[PDB]
């Protein structure tokens, strides 16, 4: 089997992407944030504290003939941005782009933090990291991908995120029309539960390539590109007037600037992030100070190849016995 679903930016900045997901019988379609940096499929629901729902579409298990309470199971998760959610668990039928999993753990939110409430366009998350990170207790549950894997034509999914435009998540096949050149595959460590890999280096604009190992995670659930402070400093030094602002919480730059591209290495291959991808606009409405899309990972504890990086590529998440990551230009 295979699946193929369109993923759409939630706003004009590509802050995140939502993908429609069918849950239950009859189908209830929710727009979820596919997140290769976590491993819980959780949704706004009929159980979510009413004051914490503001425009989201909710899952109502009582209206699904295939929903079953997973008795005793609870979940609780906190993300790198400080947001969180928690609740109980149902199993139900879940379909993504024509691909169907029966008995999928659907984690029903009783509580969500303000960040989730304030984002009316995101009805929940669908985790695509390794199942070892799943927070369901006392019985850890599998991701949608893990559950689907054996049924897939090939044990892979691919992320093809658009710049200011829709893109695609495919499951079970590699669309050879969706990228240019060849796919370069690179080793993955699952030791922390992430799609963790080592970039071979970087370049700033038309500058010379610096060979240096950068350990990081491929994370579709993170907006920006977070890299070591040395790297990020070298990038923003090429932008006149750019500076790190503790009051804003990162590098800002004059909105009148032209941003240089940023290149990262995948083995001997190179992925180029156009400068426009690194522009996240005025820090506040009407400001002439603009927020940068490349930020320091210092104090995160890990480097994150988030959407800014990943949307410049066609990315293969290979869940074979020995997982790997593939990157192609597009």
UniProtKB/Swiss-Prot annotation:
The chain holds residues 90 to 419 of 419 of the full protein. Its EC number is 3.4.23.22. This is Endothiapepsin. GO terms for molecular function: aspartic-type endopeptidase activity. Residues 17-328 form the Peptidase A1 domain. Keywords: Aspartyl protease, Disulfide bond, Hydrolase, Protease, Signal, Zymogen. Disulfide bonds join 255-290. The keyword Hydrolase applies.
